[PDB]
Every structure is written in structure tokens, then in C-alpha cells.
RNA sequence: CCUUCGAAGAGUCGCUAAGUGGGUGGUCCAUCUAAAGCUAAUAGUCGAUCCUAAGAGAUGGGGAAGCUCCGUUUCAAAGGCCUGAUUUUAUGCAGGCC
């Protein structure tokens, strides 16, 4: 099960060697060879099990063999349920086409409408997108060539139907071509709707592959980051993993904490694969330090034994988060204590904690022990252009990931005070972010 | 190449507007972007000269596409003269008459 075993192109091998992957795992060892044959796959691998390369490499190989050009339109369409996971997949795909001549693009909710439209206008050979914006771009943009679709990939069909995109998926299937298209579906679990969607999107008979309490802290939106900094500074000697909603917020927090003399490591989907591997390998043997990473980037990774796991931002998949508080304790034999920051408006999440029957513990913090570095942070943001831009980007990404959360009954953006949210990023007045509120 | 953004001519279009608007065509579609602009291929002494007469006619103002016309003191800032120890926070004109 090695990459050199399979007959592939030269740029593909160059990119794979650059990312550092040599020994492919089982999921990408029992699916890629059938995929180069041109059949259809209904997989069941969990997210982060290496299936990303498994469904990517055939797409790049097909585009290379067919020798696509920008004026040929799109040839590969990947459909993902969440905004942040599509960014990770797009970041992975940017490195498999470093030397190839094809074109890659991203279409997700909350992004620039006209910029995405123009990127489609120029001709994008591989599009990674969310179901909601795909319908808009298909039914509204003129000049988006998609009649030359050669393959289609669905990721986390269970998540897509759970969020409520089944009508959108049906309309998308009714729009996209069907004859030359050889399709692909992946889903960790499978309910009736999963094969209901699989039947109308796959050729008949496709091959299928089979693979301790929790704490919380109630904090105000203008004091979340400052309290987090206080806690991290007070607990530097321990091992802490901090989860954030987006990659831009992860990088901004890491850079800021390193600028204020607090050493932290960072993981996000906009970094190199080798950089991510190096940092995660470093974190697993240092027995000290703080790692800040996104929720999705820490899904496939096997979390080591750490002293604290903080969920600073709302979880991407609360259904998985409720189970993980017991799953990681089943795996890790150490007392890895969990913490979750909740604002007063989104305090209803505790219901899902109570209903799912998990023990619940509340933590207090004195108001006058907070770091009192707000003035320094605001003075630094007004002075350093680079830090100002990174803070604005993190604010943008946090709002964009908060707006499109599946749990609309809990995480509603209309009840979020944007002034206080931007206060925690060092902004007196909120920067303007184009979000439907 | 990547990323974040991304205005558009009103007494005008048609009494009097609009912004995924608007203009013009085709048996829903096609095509442009007005209400802004540039761009080659014998006398001091006798008369006049001075004065005003009926009237004509500038200025102020108004009409008319204009050559020009009306109106003659009119809702014009329409000009002369005089006085003074040199003018009281220190030598930058004050007052009066018609």
C-alpha cells in the first residue's frame, strides 16, 4: 500500500512527495485503485481517515488524462456540508495541483458573490462547493460552463441531509449531467435518506467500502478572548488544546499570543501539509505548551493525552462533540479535562448536554482577575498593519462560521452583539462584514 | 497568481420618476448604458467759439435670437466742500453741509 505502486502522472507524484505522504492508509489503499478503473464508490470512511486524498487523486488524474483547459468549464464538482470543511478540502487540493495546469476554485456560503461569479467566468476546472451556493451559481450565473462534468463527489452525505440540504441536493442532481459523469458518495453512517440520495446520483450497483464530566464557562462576548488569555497564561506549564471555529481565527490567535510572549503552536487548513505534520508531531512529545487548532483539522488526528481541551468557539458538529467527550476519554487514559465557553445568548446548548444524559459541571471565574491587557491589544491593532489585517480576517471568519451554523435554535447571529465581538479582537468599532443578519 | 472590496451624471427620463434600474428592437429573447467633455486623416473789439429754447439723446434699469428698442431721473453706493494742537491702552481719520 504505497503511493509509488499505483501508475500515476509525474506532477501527482511530485506533489505527493512534497506533502510527505509515502505509505497510504487502508481507506486510500482499497479505494484509489478501483477509482482509477472508473467505477463508482459508496464509501463509509470517517472524516479525517485519509479519504480526502482518496477522492482527490482520481479527480486530478482524470483531469490530467482528459487534458482540460480553462475554456472547457468544470470537470470535477465536490460537495461538502460545512463552510470550514470545504476550506480544508480546497487547501488540500491547492497542493495536489501545484505543478498541474488545471484550475481549482471554492464556492461556499458567506463569501463574495461577484468574486465567485467571476472565478466561474474565467473557467474553473475543479470546484469545491457547498450545496446552498451551488444552486444559486447554477441557476443564476451566465457563463458558468458545467456541461463537461466528468465526475461528482459527495462528502458526508449524512451531514448534508442532517443540515437540511436534501432538496438542494435533489435539484442539483436534476441540473447536473448524468451520462459521462461517474459519481462518488461518502458517508460515515447511512440512514434511509442516504441511499435515497445515492440511488439518484450513482450508477446502479456501485461498490461500497466498509471501515468523565464535561465542563463549561459562561463568558461575555467582549471578554471571551481576554479570559482565555488569562487562563492560558496562568496554566502555561500544562498541556492545553484550544479549538477554534475557523482557520483565520486560529492563525490570528496564535500570532497574537506569540507577539505577547506566550508560546503557542497553530494548526489550520491554510497551512502546508508538512508544516501541519511537523507541528502536530512536535506537540505530541513536548509535554508542555498550548496548541490552537480548528475543529475539523483535529477530527482525523488522534488527540494525545493533554491536561485541558478548551472549545473556545461553537463546535462545527455538536452531535460529534457530545460523543467525543466520552470517546477521547475512552481512548486517552489520562484525565483530559474538557472546557466549553458559552455566551449568555447561546446558553441553550446545555439542553442538548442535559438531554443526551452527560454529566455537566460549571466553572466560575472572578471578574477582577482578568488579564487587563485590552488597552495594549487595542493600541497594538491600531499600529501594526499586519496584525490589524489578521484580526479583521479572524473577525470575518468567526462571523461567517457563526452565521452558517446548523444549530440555528442555539447559535443565531441575530442575537450576537457585533460591537462586543469586535471588542475582543481589538476593535473599538466593528469592521464591516457582509453578512445577512 | 492568491485574498479583501467594489461608486456610476434629475425639472432629467417619461405633470413629473427608477436602481438585479433604464433605453431600443425581435416574434420570453437580443443589444446598449442617456441626462458631462476632448480628439488627426491779415481781427482781443465783426461772427463762430459760450448759454439755453422746442426737442433729441447716454448713463441706471428692462425687452428682444439679434441687427437693436423703451425709458430721461427712474427702489443707482451717480460728489463736491468745510472744520480739526495729530485722531487718549498711544501717531491705521474723526466730525459736519448740501
From Swiss-Prot:
Short name of one Pfam family: Helicase_C
Free-text note regarding domains: The Q motif is unique to and characteristic of the DEAD box family of RNA helicases and controls ATP binding and hydrolysis.
Consequence when changing residue 337 to A: Increases 3-fold the ATPase activity and a higher RNA/DNA heteroduplexes unwinding activity in vitro. Leads to 13% of wild-type ATPase activity and lower RNA/DNA heteroduplexes unwinding activity in vitro
Domain Helicase C-terminal: 212-381
Keywords: ATP-binding, Helicase, Hydrolase, Nucleotide-binding, Nucleus, Phosphoprotein, Ribosome biogenesis, RNA-binding, rRNA processing
Note: Transcription depends partially on SET1.
Effect of residue 341 to S: Decreases the amount of 40S ribosomal subunits at 37 degrees Celsius
Subunit structure: Interacts with RRP1. Associates in the nucleolus with the 60S and pre-60S ribosomal subunits. It has also been isolated with the nuclear pore complex.
Family: Belongs to the DEAD box helicase family. DDX18/HAS1 subfamily.
Enzyme Commission designation: 3.6.4.13
Organism field: Saccharomyces cerevisiae (strain ATCC 204508 / S288c)
Name this protein carries in UniProt: ATP-dependent RNA helicase HAS1
Record-listed ATP binding positions: 45-52
Effect caused by changing residue 187 to A: Slow growth at 18 and 16 degrees Celsius, no growth at 14 degrees Celsius and drastic decrease of the amount of 40S ribosomal subunits at 30 degrees Celsius in vivo
Resulting phenotype, residue 64 to Y: Decreases the amount of 40S ribosomal subunits at 37 degrees Celsius
Domain Helicase ATP-binding: 32-208
Annotated consequence of substituting residue 189 to A: Lethal in vivo and leads to 70-80% of wild-type ATPase activity, a 2-fold lower KM for ATP and a reduced RNA/DNA heteroduplexes unwinding activity in vitro
Subcellular location: Nucleus, Nucleolus
GO terms classed as biological process: maturation of LSU-rRNA from tricistronic rRNA transcript (SSU-rRNA, 5.8S rRNA, LSU-rRNA); maturation of SSU-rRNA; maturation of SSU-rRNA from tricistronic rRNA transcript (SSU-rRNA, 5.8S rRNA, LSU-rRNA); ribosomal large subunit biogenesis; ribosomal small subunit biogenesis; rRNA processing; snoRNA release from pre-rRNA
Short motif DEAD box, span: 155-158
Recorded consequence of changing residue 51 to A: Lethal in vivo and impairs ATPase with 2-5% of wild-type ATPase activity, a 20-fold higher KM for ATP and prevents RNA/DNA heteroduplexes unwinding activity in vitro
Hydrolase among keywords: yes
Chain span(s) of sequence motif Bipartite nuclear localization signal: 223-239
Keyword ATP-binding: yes
One GO molecular-function entry: RNA binding
Consequence recorded when altering residue 324 to A: Lethal in vivo and leads to less than 30% of wild-type ATPase activity and a 2-fold lower KM for ATP in vitro
Amino acid at each position: 500500500e504505497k503511493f509509488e505502486e499505483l501508475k500515476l502522472s509525474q506532477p501527482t507524484l511530485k506533489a505527493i512527495e512534497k506533502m510527505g505522504f509515502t505509505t497510504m492508509t487502508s481507506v486510500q489503499a482499497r479505494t484509489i485503485p478501483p477509482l482509477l478503473a472508473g467505477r463508482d464508490v459508496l464509501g463509509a470512511a470517517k472524516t479525517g481517515s485519509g479519504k480526502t486524498l482518496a477522492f482527490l487523486i482520481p479527480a486530478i488524474e482524470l483531469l490530467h488524462s482528459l487534458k482540460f483547459k480553462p475554456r472547457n468549464g468544470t470537470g470535477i464538482i465536490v460537495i461538502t456540508p460545512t463552510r470550514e470543511l470545504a476550506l480544508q478540502i480546497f487547501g488540500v487540493a491547492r497542493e495536489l495541483m501545484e505543478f498541474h495546469s488545471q484550475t481549482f476554485g471554492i464556492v461556499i456560503g458567506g463569501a463574495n458573490r461577484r468574486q465567485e461569479a467571476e472565478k466561474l467566468m474565467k473557467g474553473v476546472n475543479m470546484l469545491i462547493a457547498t450545496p446552498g451556493r451551488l444552486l444559486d451559481h447554477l441557476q443564476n450565473t451566465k457563463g458558468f460552463v458545467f456541461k463537461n462534468l466528468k465526475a461528482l463527489i459527495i462528502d458526508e452525505a449524512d451531514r448534508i441531509l442532517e443540515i437540511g440540504f436534501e432538496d438542494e441536493m435533489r435539484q442539483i442532481i436534476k441540473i447536473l449531467p448524468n451520462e459521462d459523469r461517474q459519481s462518488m458518495l461518502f458517508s460515515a453512517t447511512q440512514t434511509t435518506k442516504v441511499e435515497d440520495l445515492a440511488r439518484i446520483s450513482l450508477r446502479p450497483g456501485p461498490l461500497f467500502i466498509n471501515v468523565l464530566e464535561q465542563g463549561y464557562v459562561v463568558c461575555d462576548s467582549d471578554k471571551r478572548f481576554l479570559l482565555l488569555f488569562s487562563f492560558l497564561k496562568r496554566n502555561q506549564k500544562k498541556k492545553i488544546i484550544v479549538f477554534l471555529s475557523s482557520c483565520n481565527s486560529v492563525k490570528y490567535y496564535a500570532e497574537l499570543l506569540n507577539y505577547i510572549d506566550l508560546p503557542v503552536l497553530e494548526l489550520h487548513g491554510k497551512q502546508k501539509q508538512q508544516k501541519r505534520t511537523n507541528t502536530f508531531f512536535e506537540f505530541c512529545n513536548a509535554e508542555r505548551g498550548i496548541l490552537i487548532c480548528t475543529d475539523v483539522a483535529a477530527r482525523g488526528l488522534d488527540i494525545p493525552a493533554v491536561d485541558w481541551i478548551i472549545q473556545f468557539d461553537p463546535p462545527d458538529d455538536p452531535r460529534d462533540y457530545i460523543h467525543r467527550v466520552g470517546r477521547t476519554a475512552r481512548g486517552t487514559k489520562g484525565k483530559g479535562k474538557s472546557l466549553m465557553f458559552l455566551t449568555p445568548n447561546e446558553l441553550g446548548f446545555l439542553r442538548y448536554l442535559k438531554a443526551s444524559k452527560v454529566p455537566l459541571n460549571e466553572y466560575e471565574f472572578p471578574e477582577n482577575k482578568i488579564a487587563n491587557v485590552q488597552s495594549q491589544l487595542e493600541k497594538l491593532i491600531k499600529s501594526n498593519y499586519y496584525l490589524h489585517q489578521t484580526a479583521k480576517d479572524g473577525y470575518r471568519s468567526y462571523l461567517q462560521a457563526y452565521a452558517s451554523h446548523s444549530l440555528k435554535t442555539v447559535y443565531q447571529i441575530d442575537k450576537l452583539d457585533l460591537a462586543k465581538v469586535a471588542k475582543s479582537y481589538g476593535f473599538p468599532v466593528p469592521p464591516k462584514v457582509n453578512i445577512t443578519i
